[PDB]
Structure 1
């Protein structure tokens, strides 16, 4: 779809563990008048990583939703597969919320929450598991609209099961992901609860899930024993605390998402409805 020669690098936007995203100018008219785009490429183009990247591209191209970053096309010349997507200039929600927190009230946080929920509801209709729902993977287009911005870990559920068994962001993981490496819509709901916690702490680093969990566990632990003591903590119903200023009903949603019983966690459809109702009530539909 895109031609390598016209694409001009401008600046790096983000770097993951296997890919990076660049800000580039696509200029088919060679007049520098072309659109600025975001370009994802692999750091190391091994056979494994390229096969994974191809499926990620297929996943994004199949998604069309207001709250999912827009696929544009692919670009290659010989092993230089790149994914072209719409550029969102406010960057990740983490940076945005940090910079603008004093101006972002709870009604606005719930607007972002609702948009994330509806994007995930849409993902569920395709039987996709995101596996990395966290504010680092949410992008901001404008002050009224966020989009799920990265799908590098997203899996398609197999046809015989409602879960996929597969360096992990352990402080966002459901207990069965930690113990059984099992990922499902329900483990995405668990991670969504952590996202809600991130939003209502305004991405303060001292209150981040890793900082909170390590204080609860003990900083003497490293690597494997961190995971062990996190599992024991969650099994014993230890949970992240209610953020300062967070309404109790919003914390209650977090804690329902963090149920150890997978079957007890809410659906994204129900989360979107409840968040929308809370937001409307807070804005003056109930006071």
Structure 2
């Protein structure tokens, strides 16, 4: 029957369960779960089965949000559709944990070393868990990372082609790793480049590499970090190597010049040391050559991060994803509707 009530939230309508009360918009609502007695977030996906792109994205997010459980990754609390049959099926509502803000607000703060390293520690724990689950985000950025007033942090979604709609409605290119831009493959640590850019932006309160397009992104990188060595050029493909090796050559500033001590809190024997550790970690993440860039595991062992290490958070068991669910299998719009409906019906 109809255990629902519809509410006008802007242009569209929100037909949710009566357990969720007082819907406030943030194309995603915030409500109070009277059963769980705590505020939640409600995302609405209208006709996700309409085409391949929307359908794949929604299918992965559902499957993955159900399987993955980590406290630094936003979790699924509930999922329902107000329609009662496959013929009438239309919308999907995904109830999630509610957070207070995204990093874009934290970046404008002058944080202390404890909060900075603790926020970063949580980022890496989440990233690591995703990796163990065979998920490389490939699209980290401050708008994808959300925080709470108790200084907790979570990763908001699963990234490229695994996300459907924006909760906390920041361009991707600013944080995209060069191996992608230069036509090279990618391994787990592309996400670590982004952490480097996000960490840097936190330090100096500015976008590290603000380019006009993807290509200009490469110009902003070598201007700051210096043209890479010839052993890296040999890994490029002919067309890319021809373009890269005809760029103006840049020496690149040291990470002391990129991130001086004035940017950090430095008024103590402990603070001036902590400033160098953050700079060291930055110099191990912001590395063009991904073969010389450290891993997520190594980032968690760094002196700047390891203070908070807890094996229950940084070494949690990986999830068991059902076999061959996230492949590039093409389907009809009706096949998608049935797969998605099967995952949403009560």
Please indicate, yes or no, whether the TM-score normalized by the shorter chain is above 0.5.
Answer: yes
1:86 aligns with 2:97: yes
Deviation digits for residues 199-250 of structure 1 (CA, Å, limit 9, x no counterpart) = 223xx3xx2235xx34xxxxxxx44653463476567155782162272331
> Match of 2:24?
11
In the TM superposition, residue 72 of structure 1 has moved relative to its aligned partner by 0.9
SS of 2:28's equivalent in the other structure is: strand
Instruction: Name the one with the larger helix percent.
Output: 1
SS of 2:94's equivalent in the other structure is: strand
Change (3 A) 1:39 1:153: farther
Change (3 A) 1:92 1:70: same
1:272 aligns with 2:275: no
Number of residue pairs matched?
Answer: 242
1:190 aligns with 2:197: no
Map 1:142-221 onto structure 2 (within 5 A): 142-153=149-160, 169-180=172-183, 182-201=185-204, 204=205, 207-210=206-209, 213-214=210-211
Of 19, 22, 28, the match for 1:21: 28
In the TM superposition, residue 182 of structure 1 has moved relative to its aligned partner by 4.0
Deviation digits for residues 17-43 of structure 1 (CA, Å, limit 9, x no counterpart) = xxx432134457xxxx95431122347
In the TM superposition, residue 133 of structure 1 has moved relative to its aligned partner by 1.7
In the TM superposition, residue 112 of structure 1 has moved relative to its aligned partner by 0.6
Of 108, 114, 117, the match for 1:107: 114
Change (3 A) 1:150 1:12: farther
Deviation digits for residues 57-87 of structure 1 (CA, Å, limit 9, x no counterpart) = 2222222112111211212232212221111
1:242 aligns with 2:259: yes
Of 68, 90, 99, the match for 2:73: 68
Unaligned stretches of 5+ in structure 2?
A: 5-15, 84-88, 163-169, 229-251, 266-274, 310-346
TM normalised by structure 2 equals 0.60
In the TM superposition, residue 126 of structure 1 has moved relative to its aligned partner by 0.9
Asked whether the 8 Å contact 1:36–1:87 carries over to 2, the reply is yes
Aligned Cα root-mean-square deviation (Å): 3.3
Of 214, 221, 226, the match for 2:216: 226
> Match of 2:312?
none
- Equivalent-residue separation in structure 1 for 2:278 and 2:41 (angstroms): 34
- Equivalent-residue separation in structure 2 for 1:55 and 1:261 (angstroms): 31
Asked whether the 8 Å contact 1:42–1:49 carries over to 2, the reply is no
> Match of 1:116?
123
- Equivalent-residue separation in structure 2 for 1:136 and 1:146 (angstroms): 12
Q: Which is greater in Rg?
A: 2
Unaligned stretches of 5+ in structure 1?
A: 14-19, 156-166, 215-221, 281-287
Change (3 A) 1:168 1:42: farther
1:134 aligns with 2:158: no
> Match of 1:218?
none
Change (3 A) 1:87 1:277: closer
Change (3 A) 1:117 1:61: same
Asked whether the 8 Å contact 1:170–1:178 carries over to 2, the reply is no
